[PDB]
Amino acid sequence: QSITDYNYKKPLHNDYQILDKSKIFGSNSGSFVMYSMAADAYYIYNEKESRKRYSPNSTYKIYLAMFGLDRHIINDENSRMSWNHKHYPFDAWNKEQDLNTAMQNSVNWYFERISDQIPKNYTATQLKQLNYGNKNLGSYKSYWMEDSLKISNLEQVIVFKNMMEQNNHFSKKAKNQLSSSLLIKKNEKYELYGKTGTGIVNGKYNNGWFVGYVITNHDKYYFATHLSDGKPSGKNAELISEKILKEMGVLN
């Protein structure tokens, strides 16, 4: 809504390293950001582009999950929600869900039902304390879907790292339940957690994301890929992320 709503301009006070991942991006346009806990350092491809703010789309379901956990809308014994019988074009949505199935299959209605229960002032207080992008709730509806709420690729990393790693008002059991819902891959070398996001405008992919973290035996890394052009899907942002993480030594 304002002059600072499309841009993150706050100086990075940390050590940073500029990357060149242009061959992995190919004909897609966007940015990649990673933070290493042990190094306390950022690694950024396309720094200017990493500070442009975009709708988070389904990546904001990380925060809706944390809010629903925090407000006891869902819990550890029961995160189940029945389907309202409305037919969706993907059968994974046309059934009962829990936090794990809804996160994995990005089931909008589950997180919409969570959001509808959450008072605007709580969200405002949370987005302020978390420093979540432009903090702009607009109409307070599906505000995170190609709407007023926007966040930069650089901020996706800072905000998620700070939420998970600081002793804040979110409980340890909530953070662990959210993590369990985000786990994608675990082997002898790493655990990989994350969440895709895709914005679709007039039939075309507009906006792709993959935001997450990696735990190895040595370090913990938070990362985010944003795609703004080319074939900017969540699936593509996930693939590009995996290729970059592997090149960097994060996945072994």
Ligand SMILES: *C(=O)[C@H]([C@@H](C)O)[C@H]1CC(SCCNC=N)=C(C(=O)O)N1
């Ligand atoms: C999130 O980015 C979108 C959006 C509607 O907010 C939804 C659609 C999908 S993918 C799930 C497809 N069907 C599965 N059974 C995503 C996405 O994460 O990219 N989320």
